[PDB]
Design a binder for this molecule. Structure first.
Ligand SMILES: CCCCCCCCCCCCCC(=O)SCCNC(=O)CCNC(=O)[C@@H](O)C(C)(C)COP(=O)(O)OP(=O)(O)OC[C@H]1O[C@@H](n2cnc3c(N)ncnc32)[C@H](O)[C@@H]1OP(=O)(O)O
Length: 442
């Protein structure tokens, strides 16, 4: 009642002409989640503490015709099954012009994270045919939620085949993967969606830096502004071929220890983060051995000083679209800004000091300017960033356009207060406060 009131208001805040994928609440009403009207007095779990023994080993009943299944990443045939199911179904509109293009290379990187368990890469198949019709994945991480060590799981890649959509099969998937994670002494999750569900702990906005404006326009992924020319836009978004900041090079393995310190030192300013083990850190920021440029997933760069000191670190991952109804172009290169760290504001006591901000800003501008060059050179056509972290320092100056897509962050079975998503009351970039959202989901 005051739940629906505040939900409609939340939906109105986020109203737009769904860009990409975007889908009274009988399922979540029965779930360990913050409700909209609920003010949080103290942060912590929602359910009374439990043990694996209160949770059964028998998987939840599916309707007649279906069956569960693990997916072994390493098993080509099975892996392929996932990205076929995704690519064909992961975009609402069938004739939208674009399709997701999840590669084997990509899921090998994302789904094989330290502690990954094939039983957490869940699927559903038709009994008779063995057709994979639904998928959800879980991966282990300890989250940092305002100083508190939360041992949790990251749910991503929920997908249900379009032909049997709206069949309340999503609850079953969720319950079942909750079951499998509860049965291993994990009681929380971090999930993000573009859709508004009961527990938005945060909200950020997608933005786009054009790297190849001409192609972007020819594919209808960007507009031609009023009183402006095609050439004008080309000229406006023109990037140099070579990066500008001295010291810049790829992230070698030998850098892990020095970077990992700089990263958790830097990251420890945000209220919601993932606490990285040197193991999982190394896995995220160095991809499969020698992939070609059109298959490489994670791009990580560092700034080495003459004396060998590592000062800065930024990363980005590729996730291409397939472009359908278009004679000139078959696909669209998409870079996403990932995790980064810099020591440029370290010699300052307060993050929000006008001087500490000025310093951090002109550095982030330098680094992310180069990230763009690098991405363009990696043959990407557009560069996405999320108003999260300290992103709001450079988004505008670096010609990151406003993008009509919102990302809400959620915590399962845990209540936390609103965390700055880098947005103002009116959805413009909060350049004064920036964001305390430290995690970057896929
Ligand atoms: C350690 C404990 C474990 C923690 C577990 C964490 C669980 C959280 C996991 C959450 C995963 C997020 C992480 C990601 O991967 S977010 C990425 C999800 N991907 C997409 O949305 C792109 C492709 N979309 C689809 O395939 C859709 O058709 C899906 C399958 C998503 C919805 O299917 P459909 O449109 O054909 O209808 P339904 O009959 O199946 O189900 C309708 C009910 O389900 C609720 N719903 C619908 N969509 C979502 C959604 N995206 N997150 C959460 N809930 C969702 C909805 O509110 C309604 O419930 P209620 O409002 O009446 O109550």
């Amino acid at each position: 009642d005051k739940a629906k009131k505040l939900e409609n208001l939340l939906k109105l805040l986020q109203l737009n002409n769904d860009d990409t994928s975007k889908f009274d609440h009988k399922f979540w009403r029965t779930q360990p989640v913050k409700d909209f009207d609920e003010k949080v007095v103290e942060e912590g779990p929602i359910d009374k503490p439990k043990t694996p023994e209160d949770i059964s080993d028998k998987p939840l009943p599916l309707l007649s015709s279906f069956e569960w299944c693990s997916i072994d990443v390493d098993n080509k045939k099975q892996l392929e099954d996932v990205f076929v199911l995704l690519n064909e179904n992961y975009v609402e509109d069938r004739d939208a012009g674009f399709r997701f293009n999840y590669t084997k290379e990509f899921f090998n990187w994302a789904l094989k994270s330290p502690g990954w368990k094939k039983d957490w890469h869940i699927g559903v198949r038709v009994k008779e045919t063995q057709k994979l019709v639904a998928f959800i994945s879980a991966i282990p991480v300890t989250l940092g939620v305002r100083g508190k060590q939360v041992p949790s799981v990251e749910i991503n890649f929920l997908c249900v085949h379009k032909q049997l959509r709206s069949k309340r099969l999503t609850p079953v998937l969720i319950k079942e993967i909750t079951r499998r994670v509860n049965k291993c002494d994990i009681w929380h999750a971090l999930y993000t969606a573009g859709i508004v569900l009961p527990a938005p702990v945060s909200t950020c906005r997608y933005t786009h830096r054009p790297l190849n404006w001409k192609k972007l326009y020819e594919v209808d992924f960007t507009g031609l502004p009023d009183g402006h020319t095609e050439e004008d836009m080309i000229a406006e978004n023109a990037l140099p071929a070579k990066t500008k900041t001295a010291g810049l090079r790829k992230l070698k393995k030998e850098d892990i220890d020095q970077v990992f310190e700089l990263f958790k030192r830097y990251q420890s300013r945000f209220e919601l983060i993932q606490i990285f083990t040197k193991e999982e850190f190394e896995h995220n920021f160095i991809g499969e051995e020698s992939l070609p440029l059109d298959k490489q997933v994670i791009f990580s760069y560092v700034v080495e000083q003459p004396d060998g000191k590592i000062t800065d670190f930024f990363s980005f991952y590729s996730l291409p679209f397939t472009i359908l109804n278009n004679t000139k172009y078959k696909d669209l290169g998409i870079g996403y800004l990932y995790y980064y760290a810099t020591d440029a504001d370290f010699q300052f006591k307060d993050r929000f000091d006008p001087k500490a901000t000025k310093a951090l800003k002109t550095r982030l501008c330098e680094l992310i300017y180069d990230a763009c060059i690098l991405a363009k050179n990696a043959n990407m056509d557009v560069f996405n960033a999320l108003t999260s972290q300290d992103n709001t320092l450079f988004l505008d100056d670096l010609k990151f356009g406003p993008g009509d897509g919102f990302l809400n962050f959620y915590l399962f079975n845990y209540r936390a207060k609103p965390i700055t998503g880098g947005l103002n009351p009116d959805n413009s970039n909060d350049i004064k406060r920036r964001s305390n959202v430290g995690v970057v989901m896929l």
